[PDB]
Amino acid sequence: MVLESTMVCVDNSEYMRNGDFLPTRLQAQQDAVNIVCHSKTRSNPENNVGLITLANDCEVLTTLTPDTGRILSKLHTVQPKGKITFCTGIRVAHLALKHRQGKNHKMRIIAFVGSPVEDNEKDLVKLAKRLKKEKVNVDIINFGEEEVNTEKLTAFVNTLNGKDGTGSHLVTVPPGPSLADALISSPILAG
Amino acid sequence: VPGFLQQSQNSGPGQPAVWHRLEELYTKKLWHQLTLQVLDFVQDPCFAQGDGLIKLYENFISEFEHRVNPLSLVEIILHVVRQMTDPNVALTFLEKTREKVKSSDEAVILCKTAIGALKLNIGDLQVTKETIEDVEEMLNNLPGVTSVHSRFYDLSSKYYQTIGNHASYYKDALRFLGCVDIKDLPVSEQQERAFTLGLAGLLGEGVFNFGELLMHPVLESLRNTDRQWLIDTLYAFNSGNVERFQTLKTAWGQQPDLAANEAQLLRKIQLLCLMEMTFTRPANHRQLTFEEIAKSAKITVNEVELLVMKALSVGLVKGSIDEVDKRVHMTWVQPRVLDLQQIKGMKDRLEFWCTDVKSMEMLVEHQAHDILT
Amino acid sequence: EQDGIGEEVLKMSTEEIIQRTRLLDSEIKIMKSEVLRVTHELQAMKDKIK
Amino acid sequence: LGLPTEAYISVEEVHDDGTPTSKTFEHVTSEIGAEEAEEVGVEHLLRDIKDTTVGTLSQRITNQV
Amino acid sequence: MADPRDKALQDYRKKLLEHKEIDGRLKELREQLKELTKQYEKSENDLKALQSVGQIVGEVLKQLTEEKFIVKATNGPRYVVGCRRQL
Numbered sequence A: 001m002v003l004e005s006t007m008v009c010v011d012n013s014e015y016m017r018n019g020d021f022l023p024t025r026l027q028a029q030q031d032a033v034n035i036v037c038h039s040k041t042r043s044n045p046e047n048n049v050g051l052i053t054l055a056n057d058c059e060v061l062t063t064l065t066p067d068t069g070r071i072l073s074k075l076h077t078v079q080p081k082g083k084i085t086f087c088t089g090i091r092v093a094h095l096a097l098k099h100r101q102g103k104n105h106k107m108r109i110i111a112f113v114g115s116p117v118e119d120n121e122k123d124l125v126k127l128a129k130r131l132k133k134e135k136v137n138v139d140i141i142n143f144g145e146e147e148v149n150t151e152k153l154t155a156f157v158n159t160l161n162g163k164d165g166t167g168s169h170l171v172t173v174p175p176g177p178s179l180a181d182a183l184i185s186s187p188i189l190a191g
Numbered sequence B: 001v002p003g004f005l006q007q008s009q010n011s012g013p014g015q016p017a018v019w020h021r022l023e024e025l026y027t028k029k030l031w032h033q034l035t036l037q038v039l040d041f042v043q044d045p046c047f048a049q050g051d052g053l054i055k056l057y058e059n060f061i062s063e064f065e066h067r068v069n070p071l072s073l074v075e076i077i078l079h080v081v082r083q084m085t086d087p088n089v090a091l092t093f094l095e096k097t098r099e100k101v102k103s104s105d106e107a108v109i110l111c112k113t114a115i116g117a118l119k120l121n122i123g124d125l126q127v128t129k130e131t132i133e134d135v136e137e138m139l140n141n142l143p144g145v146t147s148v149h150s151r152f153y154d155l156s157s158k159y160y161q162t163i164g165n166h167a168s169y170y171k172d173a174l175r176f177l178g179c180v181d182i183k184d185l186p187v188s189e190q191q192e193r194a195f196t197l198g199l200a201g202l203l204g205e206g207v208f209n210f211g212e213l214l215m216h217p218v219l220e221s222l223r224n225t226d227r228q229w230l231i232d233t234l235y236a237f238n239s240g241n242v243e244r245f246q247t248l249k250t251a252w253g254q255q256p257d258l259a260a261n262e263a264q265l266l267r268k269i270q271l272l273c274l275m276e277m278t279f280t281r282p283a284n285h286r287q288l289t290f291e292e293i294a295k296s297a298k299i300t301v302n303e304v305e306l307l308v309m310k311a312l313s314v315g316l317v318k319g320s321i322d323e324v325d326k327r328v329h330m331t332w333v334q335p336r337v338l339d340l341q342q343i344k345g346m347k348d349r350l351e352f353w354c355t356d357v358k359s360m361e362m363l364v365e366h367q368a369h370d371i372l373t
Numbered sequence C: 001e002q003d004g005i006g007e008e009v010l011k012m013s014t015e016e017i018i019q020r021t022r023l024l025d026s027e028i029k030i031m032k033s034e035v036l037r038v039t040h041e042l043q044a045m046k047d048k049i050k
Numbered sequence D: 001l002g003l004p005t006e007a008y009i010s011v012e013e014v015h016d017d018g019t020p021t022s023k024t025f026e027h028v029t030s031e032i033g034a035e036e037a038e039e040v041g042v043e044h045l046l047r048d049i050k051d052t053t054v055g056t057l058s059q060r061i062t063n064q065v
Numbered sequence E: 001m002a003d004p005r006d007k008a009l010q011d012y013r014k015k016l017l018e019h020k021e022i023d024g025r026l027k028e029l030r031e032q033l034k035e036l037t038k039q040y041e042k043s044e045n046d047l048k049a050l051q052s053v054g055q056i057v058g059e060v061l062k063q064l065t066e067e068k069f070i071v072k073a074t075n076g077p078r079y080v081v082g083c084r085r086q087l
Helices: A025-043 A069-075 A087-098 A121-134 A151-160 B002-007 B015-027 B033-043 B051-063 B070-084 B090-100 B108-119 B128-137 B148-158 B167-179 B187-200 B217-223 B230-239 B244-253 B262-270 B274-280 B290-296 B301-314 B340-367 C002-006 C025-049 D036-046 D059-064 E007-011 E013-050
Strands: A004-009 A049-052 A106-113 A137-142 A170-172 B320-322 B327-329 D007-009 D026-028 E058-063 E069-073 E078-081
Touching: A004 A025, A004 A087, A025 A049, A025 A069, A025 A106, A049 A069, A049 A087, A087 A106, A087 A121, A121 A151, A137 A151, A151 A170, B002 B015, B002 B051, B015 B033, B033 B070, B051 B070, B070 B090, B070 B108, B090 B108, B108 B128, B108 B148, B128 B148, B148 B167, B167 B187, B187 B217, B187 B230, B217 B230, B230 B244, B230 B262, B244 B262, B274 B290, B274 B301, B290 B301, B290 B327, B301 B320, C025 E013, E007 E013
Parallel strands: A004 A049, A004 A106, A106 A137, A137 A170
Antiparallel strands: B320 B327, D007 D026, E058 E069, E069 E078
């Protein structure tokens, strides 16, 4: 009966046009959305899930709505051909969480990183110190290719919820036929 | 397949540091850093005789590819078939690459340019107008490729070596420079581009010089050093004078493609001094007599009537001709660019325009204040 | 059915697992993408006529 | 001052001839027109000066002022 | 794994029974969508038809001034009206 506004954030960059896995990375990230939208459904039907892209533009394809059938129609045929842009992706997600119909829901943002980020260390810590002053918990999940133990992401998780925050888990999946079992061990219940 | 890359390791400098990188990125099954390394191998300015080895590897790509943007695939295969230098089967191979991807990405519009750009050497009449037309009709609803207009200009440059192509080429020579923003290639090809740009703007039917041309800096910064005449003959044409010495020195200079058009360029400036001499006097006494045209355009009196009917026919002016005083009335309607020196007197006429209207409002507001309400 | 046999005998490594892995693979991805986009349009137009 | 509403249009060209590409929102002229009830309902609202039709030499000079 | 003439001969014949299976009903779905759009177009024409008024049939008797016309209905009284903009 937890009241939150879960904002899922997929990646349709150009680097998703490959399969390091035995299935498709697009099929891997699409089924990742299925197991979290069904997760937030069965826990509390009074929540809402909305998808957002960040490649070359942060086009709001579906508004943050408690329905799921609009999302399932739009999870397909995404056509990944863009360049990944991550620095504006947090600010457009927090701008979506201000335009809500009810200000009694909690704030949770999950994001799907399927491409390497190339950003300044100043630009991540200004967003990190902004969300500290805004009390916003953002989860970061890595897909596909991943540099193990990055400087930028790990310092962003640290500066997000430092000094006994929430526990926004950094999901580091290895390449191989592993499905979202790393995404349903801890983050489906202990986010 | 791992044995194929061990035996094809050689014939590229610093072999193992880039062939161990290629075999590891094959096993990770990614297709972007793998793609940029193959594009790095083609971009390498060497002889590149390994076309027979890469055409099995490009075959090995397309078996289990099904992920890669065919835009980069078409762009990398057109350099390979250009290196193979085989015009018998280049068309049959490229059509096979064109039909094997008909997907929602607009790579076929680059393939149709790749058809013509390999075909425009011999027999350029039967299908070339069709494949020129096919690209521009398929240049709709997406002005964001910027390469399909680039290759459409490159085939138009090969189509410039025809009998009639002088107006649409110069208009496309602008549009290529309109879409491109960077230069990314040395001076030793751009100085030939601004030379034939100066010829296409010169040998034209409905073009005088088309100002906002000499401000465009890629031509004057590269040819101010060298030959110093094509800029100078455009100085005299923008000024509109005859300047019989300077337009003769370009006739001595440029021997081809100018003896057949020297009477035309004398004809083009005599219709061009008119819009200068009606610009010299700012509509004070625009009724100009025959003596001033015969002196400026150095034309005889028996041709000043045929000269101005040609100018009224084109549409550079909409005046009339009186012969009871042998004076030509002029209502100039075809404007152009001017300099900062005409800007100065334009403001002083505007400051006179400002202070006369404001003074008369003060006479009306003072006189009719009691009946204003 | 003669072309289906004759293209498997003359060649062995030219268009066997090469031709059959393009016009079947590029077909089914369009067929997967269009079995649903047409369906999502068809259901929405049942709502509009209702 | 006298400044009405303003409208542009969505056009997509390069820019002019050889200048780099942009948007260049072109201007479309605008006017104001009411409807039959939307114009009669206005006159009932004002009730302060009302500005009668064809003017008796005072409104016409101010229209030139 | 390798290229024989037996496995690759049967490698696609198990697929062509499937690629024509998903393709065959695609023409049925587009035909169903096309007839529904025609039925939708018939519905939207009736929505525009539903916002209609009806007009009084009358005859001009004479012309009074440049904007005054004396007309008369088939049974009703006589009126003094004008024209729209460009008649």
